[PDB]
Amino acid sequence: EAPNQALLRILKETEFKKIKVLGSGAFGTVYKGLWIPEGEKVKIPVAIKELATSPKANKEILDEAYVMASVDNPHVCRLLGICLTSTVQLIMQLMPFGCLLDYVREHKDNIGSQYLLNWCVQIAKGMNYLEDRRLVHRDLAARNVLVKTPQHVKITDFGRAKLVPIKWMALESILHRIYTHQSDVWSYGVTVWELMTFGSKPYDGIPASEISSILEKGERLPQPPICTIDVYMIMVKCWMIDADSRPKFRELIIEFSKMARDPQRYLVIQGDERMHLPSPTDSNFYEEDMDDVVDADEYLI
Numbered sequence: 057e058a059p060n061q062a063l064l065r066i067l068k069e070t071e072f073k074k075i076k077v078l079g080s081g082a083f084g085t086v087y088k089g090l091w092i093p094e095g096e097k098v099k100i101p102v103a104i105k106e107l108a109t110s111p112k113a114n115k116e117i118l119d120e121a122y123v124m125a126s127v128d129n130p131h132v133c134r135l136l137g138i139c140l141t142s143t144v145q146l147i148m149q150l151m152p153f154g155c156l157l158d159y160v161r162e163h164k165d166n167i168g169s170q171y172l173l174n175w176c177v178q179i180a181k182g183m184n185y186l187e188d189r190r191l192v193h194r195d196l197a198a199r200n201v202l203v204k205t206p207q208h209v210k211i212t213d214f215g216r217a218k219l220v221p222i223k224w225m226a227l228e229s230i231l232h233r234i235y236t237h238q239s240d241v242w243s244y245g246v247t248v249w250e251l252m253t254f255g256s257k258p259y260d261g262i263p264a265s266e267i268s269s270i271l272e273k274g275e276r277l278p279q280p281p282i283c284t285i286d287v288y289m290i291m292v293k294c295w296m297i298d299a300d301s302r303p304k305f306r307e308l309i310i311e312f313s314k315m316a317r318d319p320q321r322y323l324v325i326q327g328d329e330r331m332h333l334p335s336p337t338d339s340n341f342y343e344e345d346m347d348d349v350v351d352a353d354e355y356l357i
């Protein structure tokens with residue numbers, strides 16, 4: 057197929073400063089930082105993913121760097137560059153509000169129908185872009201959707217993307233390890249369920265080995281209280297046994313968009329419309345020298 061002419065930017069260690077730790081797991085650690093390129097007079101807020109050195113872990117991060125440097129969409133996280141130190145670090149855009157999963161849990165009392173439905177549209181747009189680029193995510197979940205601003209979310213975590221999270225997986229994937237854009241649609245349905253329930257764990261208490269049998273019988277995630285039959289019906293269609301019967305991401309963009317034009321007809325939330333989240337039109341929305349700071353989305357070379 058088509059040659060991948062994406063540019064892999066090699067960044068000097070001296071061009072960026074680690075500020076604090078954002079998260080730490082088995083992979084290594086993610087830091088909040090600033091990237092001050094060449095003689096540009098710009099400070100770009102960045103997230104630095106730093107890898108111990110084992111030949112296997114270095115290949116896995118370079119496989120993720122390959123995919124992440126090959127995407128370019130407002131609703132997908134792109135790789136700004138890599139730094140070749142003794143460790144190997146991925147330079148990414150800072151998503152200051154973290155993962156959408158923790159965001160819905162921490163801010164449920166100020167999350168209205170407008171925000172929820174717009175997030176669904178944005179995720180479907182990012183996913184439809186990945187489809188255009190012939191990329192199967194294989195790990196779509198609310199934990200892997202990051203928040204740039206409460207009004208702007210992006211799909212990330214390409215560590216499993218190709219051309220195991222059982223409770224988010226399609227039945228063909230659990231049983232036969234078959235991954236399609238239609239298996240991503242199933243994971244999209246589960247992600248929406250996570251948003252609509254304000255961060256509830258799917259099939260809470262049920263062990264992962266029991267899921268495949270539960271799905272085969274016909275058991276699915278329940279109707280969230282805020283969901284009208286209109287929204288639940290969509291989630292349900294993402295969980296059909298026949299992958300081809302499931303909606304396409306382009307149809308999900310359309311369906312969630314029609315709904316986002318009249319959000320209270322499709323999601324029933326007490327106190328909705330009187331709820332407000334931070335916006336770039338708020339005071340003190342934007343610690344260091346705030347001079348010459350530019351978001352990665354506006355920094356293009």
Ligand SMILES: CO[C@H]1CCN(c2nccc(Nc3cc4c(cn3)nc(C)n4C(C)C)n2)C[C@H]1F
Binds near residue numbers: 083103150151155
């Ligand atoms: C497991 O590795 C993950 C780490 C998170 N990730 C990612 N992609 C693109 C941008 C980005 N930036 C980013 C990540 C942040 C963040 C601010 N900005 N605050 C927190 C708490 N986190 C994560 C650790 C979830 N983070 C995708 C993968 F790199």
